[PDB]
Design a protein around this ligand. Structure first.
Ligand SMILES: Cc1cn([C@H]2C[C@H](O)[C@@H](COP(=O)(O)O)O2)c(=O)[nH]c1=O
Ligand SMILES: Cc1cn([C@H]2C[C@H](O)[C@@H](COP(=O)(O)O)O2)c(=O)[nH]c1=O
Ligand SMILES: Cc1cn([C@H]2C[C@H](O)[C@@H](COP(=O)(O)O)O2)c(=O)[nH]c1=O
Ligand SMILES: Cc1cn([C@H]2C[C@H](O)[C@@H](COP(=O)(O)O)O2)c(=O)[nH]c1=O
Ligand SMILES: Cc1cn([C@H]2C[C@H](O)[C@@H](COP(=O)(O)O)O2)c(=O)[nH]c1=O
Ligand SMILES: Cc1cn([C@H]2C[C@H](O)[C@@H](COP(=O)(O)O)O2)c(=O)[nH]c1=O
Ligand SMILES: Cc1cn([C@H]2C[C@H](O)[C@@H](COP(=O)(O)O)O2)c(=O)[nH]c1=O
Ligand SMILES: Cc1cn([C@H]2C[C@H](O)[C@@H](COP(=O)(O)O)O2)c(=O)[nH]c1=O
Lengths: 290, 290, 291, 290
């Protein structure tokens, strides 16, 4: 479980009220599984097994009750509280101890990636010795995000957190890879005009040093919107349509743990049975008939 | 004085694992509010204001922080734990002291009704002096529910829980009205068919006494299925389609309390003020204007 | 004594939906399991109207006629007339003059989809009104798209404006209208608006101004499904699918309504189903003869 | 010069009655464009510009009415009728003249493919000099399709058309690529157990010659189902959720021709004119901007 990642799963939850009044947004379903399974799955697909989950004072213990130490899936999971949703970059101040002196990835708890050859897409980022990697994705509402501006060739030259005058239609996704300098940069940030510690500031620091890779995530990939009540419906439908057409599950941690050898046949079987009244447990057991 | 209702909102949620490993089914979002808002709504539209909410040990506290004592919306809410999901009929045993010598309605925490004239459809039931009333609804999969059989003249002649060979296509819905006899009937129920104290055995006792009304819920009403992950997507999409077209909400308790005179403008406004930062409050606040 | 004749206006440019509607007429598009026009047709039937005139474009009108025929298979009588250009809703009544004759009329738009409990009882006063006109008001969130009716402190209709910039309310006028025999001449006496369209809203205002306009409230318990955009099309189809799959019934099945209302008998239905017995629609037709 | 392909857009469409009673299935919308736009886009993306569209006596003239000779898209489109749906392989018998001595692809008119690097997966199959390529895709209901049987090493070893007992969950999709040998093989076919002249039989012949590439289409690709009223809606929601998140269209032919250099900026603006009053024209127009 040598390689490291962080899932930032807290947040004010204000926008979705009152759905999020007694439930962390990141415990909400997306079709047939809790939302956090998706980003967890992404980290696992990047070959990352040592993972810190950050959420609220109220909700962190809920994530721990759900997933425990992660050993049942061949992972090492730990937990820590963010007292207040002070910014994406706080991930790294809170995860200081967890990070030690290693590389680290950060994925937002509500980011849902899907599409062919993702693991390979992430491959260079995971293998990069120094610097950082982020991914850029074309959307119709860039204002909402960190916006990456491109050269008359395809070279990134500027980032902006939520620009009134977006300079491109490319948003930076909520998946990030860093070397070990990120902790110190985070520790040096002052909040922004939005009153947040902005991961955009960190990315610009790496950019200004000429150490930022910005990889393009083409239109062939889905990077699902999860901001509104309506977008949540759409994210679930999308997953449902994939799974029911293929007879396969998207971002199922037990399967991914199995396929990658984190856990064996006897393990899957044991995880499958309590879940076997429905399709989820039956799908997992059947995977095992090898 | 206040009429009395129970919302049974626990269960184990096996059928929805692993979603329900994480969160109470009756806290899953149905578009823009928790599921329990829809059944609460329903009791309210019937004029029932003194409501007991029964959930699990782990979940009750969470329904408590979500809803509070109800005074804010002009209701009186109280709570009780059901240690084990030993059947719908146990609601009356748990609620025996709440109920006293009064009539009581039972609505399932997962029952979503929508349609024109719902309060009229429930009026006879609310005002029945002796006996019980249930509602029948035509489904394509009768075998999953309690099923009511009629004779050629439309008389309820039989009621069978999850029959092998359904005698009709009419299911019994999750809304029930009882006189004060139901408490003693419950206390005598026997773990018949499957480990739970069944609502159909209660109902079967009223039928045999000639005291069960079966009101027909026509096809113009919607009774949203929350049974599977796919049906929960549909419930949500169904509500969203109504609301987005109308610019109005379905089963917004605060709205309803206001339209019925449970609370007045000033209360609505006092509710909205702290919520105006989000779309829900914005909706509350416009209420008090048009 | 008059009867009430029916008109379905299923014309229009269709530009908003290009190029879907370069291949297919909007009102032939599927709403889940049947052509869109089946809905508003079904609405007339539920109101008891069996004699119906369908108006559509020159290009599209023969397609509707391939689909529906003369209506007799469902105990209806359907006729067809062409609207050369989408010059306005109220032209429907100029085009249908020879059809309406001296009777009462009901016009429903080809893309209007109504669903909910006691719909027919909602239309009843309108159907039985002897003189004047009846429209239906529905609270929407984008009133600027429709004719908007303004109500006074007492809830009394007080004005109507077409696609106004500053709506005086959130109540739209529904795409289903009921009229006595006065409407044809009113329509023939209309001058086109600034935007160049013979407006039905100007007809309703006239009736309004005469004191002969009933405006009936279609409550939030009813659904009035949007078909203006591709995205509202998928939602209409998803809305119907969810109803139909939960119930094992069908929304707006002309055959069924004809049967239930006595327009045709069990044998006619079986005669309809046989040829169709290998598809799911036929299977439904046939099961309703059974039990 | 121009590479060739066939779109087989026939069949009764009987199981969709009455939706298909006065419309060809393959003219039904999927979200914002007719169904046939999809597989047409597929061939385009494969570098195939000379295309034969096959359909029924009644529907063929409707396709020719919508698309014309395709030169407004920088293509060559022609048409031919299939009197009766007596087999997919009939495509090559009806298209013998149009094929001549060249390679030919075939795509089914109701097939919708999407995903990251799809053009690359198609370009390998077009590159191929001798033999044939099909694609295998994991699905829920294989018995509806041609089914592939694999080794313990994962080598494709056998094929069966709609097996009662499927040997795997891997179906053959409706996209195929052949060298010029496919026409003689189709001319030698005899009707199978079912009514029909099977493409599966030709594929088996290539497989047994050691000349069939069975290209695996990973679970990251979508291959949407158009077989029921419900699958259509599903395929439309999928497409719509993708386009509205990205502000980009899926399988817009005019866009593909432009991006691939089939047509220039001027020809795009001309295409935009008749569509200019809606989002679809605007999208084409905006691409000649920025
Ligand atoms: C701003 C912020 C967001 N979040 C989470 C909530 C979402 O998963 C994600 C994005 O937040 P928003 O969605 O930008 O509030 O990050 C935190 O956990 N802590 C923070 O300080
Ligand atoms: C270039 C282009 C690709 N596509 C589709 C084809 C493939 O399904 C997908 C390829 O995306 P990709 O760059 O991420 O591989 O996008 C279009 O629909 N329109 C276009 O103009
Ligand atoms: C059986 C049972 C269900 N419930 C709630 C959850 C279910 O959605 C609903 C009906 O349960 P059911 O699955 O047996 O029909 O009632 C309880 O709160 N306690 C119970 O003992
Ligand atoms: C009788 C009948 C009604 N309807 C519709 C009209 C209304 O929208 C709704 C009325 O349902 P209701 O029985 O609850 O009043 O059902 C059909 O779609 N098919 C039918 O066969
Ligand atoms: C203006 C007009 C609209 N229509 C149809 C097209 C639309 O479906 C509907 C509403 O038109 P608008 O809504 O006035 O464009 O009525 C015609 O059939 N004829 C007409 O002259
Ligand atoms: C009175 C009231 C009803 N409702 C719901 C209950 C019904 O299912 C629906 C139909 O109303 P109608 O009976 O006015 O059509 O509206 C609210 O959501 N809020 C309210 O204030
Ligand atoms: C058998 C056959 C199918 N088709 C079309 C109809 C369907 O869209 C598709 C697949 O049909 P299938 O499952 O029966 O093979 O091919 C033809 O156009 N011609 C034919 O000869
Ligand atoms: C191995 C594995 C992949 N995936 C996902 C990750 C990517 O989104 C996509 C990659 O598919 P691919 O095989 O076509 O490249 O599939 C799962 O959801 N579960 C799994 O067990």
């Amino acid at each position: 479980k040598m390689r490291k990642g962080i899932i930032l799963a807290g947040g004010s939850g204000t926008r979705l009220y009152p759905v999020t009044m007694a439930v962390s947004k990141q415990l909400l379903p997306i079709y047939d599984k809790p939302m956090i399974y998706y980003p967890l799955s992404t980290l696992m697909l990047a070959g990352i097994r040592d993972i810190l989950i950050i959420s609220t004072p109220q909700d962190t213990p809920r994530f721990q009750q759900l997933l425990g130490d992660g050993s049942q899936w061949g992972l090492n999971l730990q937990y820590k509280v963010q007292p207040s949703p002070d910014g994406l970059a706080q991930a790294f101040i809170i995860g200081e101890e967890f990070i030690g002196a290693d590389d680290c990835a950060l994925v937002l708890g509500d980011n849902i990636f899907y599409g062919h050859d993702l693991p390979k897409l992430m491959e260079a980022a995971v293998n990069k010795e120094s610097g950082a990697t982020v991914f850029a994705y074309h959307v119709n509402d860039p204002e909402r995000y960190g916006v990456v501006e491109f050269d008359k060739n395809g070279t990134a030259i500027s980032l902006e957190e939520k620009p009134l005058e977006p300079k491109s239609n490319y948003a930076v996704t909520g998946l990030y890879f860093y070397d070990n300098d990120v902790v110190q940069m985070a520790k040096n940030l002052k909040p922004s005009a939005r009153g947040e510690l902005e991961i955009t500031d960190i990315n610009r620091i790496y950019l200004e040093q000429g150490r930022l890779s910005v990889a393009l995530m083409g239109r062939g990939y889905a990077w699902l919107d999860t901001g509104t009540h309506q977008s949540l419906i759409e994210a679930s439908n999308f997953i449902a349509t994939i799974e029911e057409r293929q007879g396969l599950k998207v971002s199922c941690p037990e399967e991914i743990a199995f396929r990658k050898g984190f856990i064996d046949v006897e393990q899957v079987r044991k995880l499958a049975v309590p879940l076997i009244k429905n399709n989820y447990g039956q799908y997992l057991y059947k995977m095992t008939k090898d």
